[PDB]
Amino acid sequence: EVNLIESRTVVPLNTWVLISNFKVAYNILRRPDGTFNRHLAEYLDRKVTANANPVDGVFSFDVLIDRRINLLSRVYRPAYADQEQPPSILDLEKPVDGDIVPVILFFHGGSFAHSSANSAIYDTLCRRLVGLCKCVVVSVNYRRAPENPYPCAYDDGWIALNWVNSRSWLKSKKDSKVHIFLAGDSSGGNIAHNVALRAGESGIDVLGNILLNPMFGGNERTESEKSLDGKYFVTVRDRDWYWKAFLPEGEDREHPACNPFSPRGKSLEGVSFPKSLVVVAGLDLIRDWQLAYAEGLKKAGQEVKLMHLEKATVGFYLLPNNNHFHNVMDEISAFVNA
Template sequence: MAANSDEILHDFPPMIRQYKDGRIERLMGTETVPPSVDPETGVQSKDVVIAPEINLYARLYLPKSAIPGSKLPLLVYFHGGGFVVESAFSPLYQKHLNCLVAEAKVVVVSVDYRLAPEHPLPVAYEDAWLGFKWAVSQSNEEEWIKEYAELNRVFLGGDSAGGNIAHNIAVRFGAEKLDGVNFIGTFLNCPFFWGKEIIGNEETHGITGRDYADRLWHYACPGTTKGCDDPRINPGKDLKLSGLGCKKLMVYVAEKDILRSRGLFYKELLGKRGWDGEIEVVDVEGENHCYSVEYPTGEKGKEMIKRVASFLNQ
């Protein structure tokens, strides 16, 4: 073993660590569970291949109450994990989406995009766009989408880094469009937005909090030329923001989350840029980052899922 094999090059506890010899150690988000019929909710799930040449997969979810020919909203979802950990197949997201699908009675396509640093950004964005296009083009192919999904009611959603991805896919849809798709709204749960300038209460988290977010973005997106003012992480620098491709947004932020101020500022940004849609921002007291993903059956987790279900069925 090389003498320097245990020397750490990048360290992002509790998520990931990279050593100077190139080894990557994921400290969380590596466990997976198979698709199933959930005994508590009756929600079914199955895995599909989107693009085998790049190992791009997704997990599909179907509520117990689904009836062939009775169409349900379609939600394309992106998991969190700082662009570097977690998957669409983890027990964390299996439980979270089982709860959401059971309450909202929607069809979900949870895209398993590839992770940095092995696949640095923009790979995750490209995978997400491929996954979105695949989901909305399956009216005559994939059985669950063909039989149960209504492409006249398409939504995007995601938490943390997945919320960032959902936002960027909504912006791309606004610029490129997809024929025959009625993209209604986007749900962002504690989205990972950032920027060079301190805003709101970010300074109360100390230099460690800001330094962590700065470093994580550069680690996941080493090719960025604008750093934390890259428009993909800082919507305030995105000249395409006014063309956001949906007309409805729901954004959740949490009081104890360092990303809270960015989520609140997102609404102000959209208004300044002239986006003419509707946005609801829900600021939850006393909670941490993505609390509802961690505890979907807790009191506040259930409350959020009910509210998101209402958003998806408007």
Template sequence: MASSTPAAPYVVEDCGRNLQLLSDGTVIRFEDYNTLPPPALPPALSAVQYKDVVYDATRGLKLRAYKPPPPLAGGEKKKLPVVVYFHGGGYLIGSYEMDNFHACCLRLAHDLPAVVLSADYRLAPEHRLPAAHDDAATVISWLRDDQAAWLAEWGSADFDRVFVAGDSAGAGIVHHVAVRLGSGQLPVDRNAMRVAGCVMLFPFFGGEERTRSEAENPPGPYLTLPSSDQAWRLALPRGATRDHPLANPFGPGSPAMEAVAMPPLLVVVAQLDLLRDRGVDYVARLRKMGKSVEVVEFEGQDHGFFAVEPFGDAADELVRVVRRFVHGDGADVSNKS
């Protein structure tokens, strides 16, 4: 009897220039996946210092730490807030090293100003959720436990004003960090450090029932409904739907959040974003629970506009909004319409 030849692996999920998932579980990643045009950096940003730091030696995970230039001679030296930033990419792609994410963090460090920590995390489908959320919690624990070393080298950091921020999938990470903080799953000694607020830019949430913006907004240049659905298929635990608590904070199986003591939140949504209504609904539900949540909507903008054009007019206003929130220690900066 002739032996049968095993079938060659075939593509079961094709993410275009980003990656492919084969039938045998192999993931092929393409080096040229970044389709964002690299931004031209303003000369002033060359004064921002940065370095890469390992925060999880076991998994080889790093972050990039940014420190703004000192004040001009005679200027008042003040301790700076610490912004922990998580990049977007649908949980599938991205790194703090990407030109556009790097530019965003250079700008935040310089213009807020703040000490900014831009962290990488494990990506799906090799590492499905909640791996990215666990890595984000590790960043917060690392920051809490390694303050002495930080203060010795970066003495301007104010650990009483730590903000957790992110865009798209990174904003989804921020939500889960905030819930872990508020529910006691991620303990933080307030005598050592305090998370003063969270910033969520165009949060990447999901759900089985389509929202109006998902049904009516046109596909964006960097996010479409099929690509969003595909990202959730590859990022969620196998067999999970988009109503899984890791995707939908208010799905049928999601835990109640009324008793969760979340930090003050700033949520930014974009008018043309397919996910716009999910962000607005998120804000409305949390406000109904009595949470401190502010929302700012950018008209005429689409998903991820800050990373796409870090130095455009909309990005200028976004940085001003974040600056008021951070330096106002959670003060209301929203249009409450």
């Protein structure tokens, strides 16, 4: 039955190895009964520490945003100009220099159960964002399901957003305000959407959202789900598993946390919502849900830029060896600096 020749035809071999390795490892971590092998998961994951020493013009440091829950976030910044010595622990919060200095609050993917801000795949992505967008990136180490399900991840994002918005050293010279952009791939994209909703209801104005292959769903089995199931790394079976681990007991996929345009979700008509850049991989089995999301925003009168990469798969942005990565990074930079 198993034949993976098809998925190898659409991606570079090293990309195929990376995503397939996660695919097989995650099969082991997810248990039929709904439990998760957290110990093995954290052992297998490849992690990296922060580093005050600039590498490729980027340095980083970790911050404890909230002790009660041990919420950490990693800050990435471009190397200081005219730096005679590397940054000491007292030089990490040096006021940003620039009339307009965008700050991207990033939420990693992993379907709400996998990865951390210090996972190498995400530390590398954030470093690339800093250099390709010329900005500061703050990556949130949000709590994961099934141990910490809905709404824990959203709450962590809210706490992180307030922390970022209140940093005096992150204020732009122009308007003395922190220019915030929310970004995230997979579940991180879902978190960005929901944090943005809460932001608008408060006094925080997010300038824009960047969603990469955002994780959304619903009770209905879309055509893309039925046709692409198991062909390109993802299966409807694992999608169902992650939704069940994240959503409240007894809930279904029409819960607003899963389907932002569910009948249960609040209308976005005439709401203060930031402009959005929605990237959809054509070979991502939940493509139809993602396309419906972009259309939902447009229909609600929100500003939305849709990038439908018909031959891209999940994880295309983890390696800089394909045109999808290049095209998307170009648009992200244009979006943030517009």
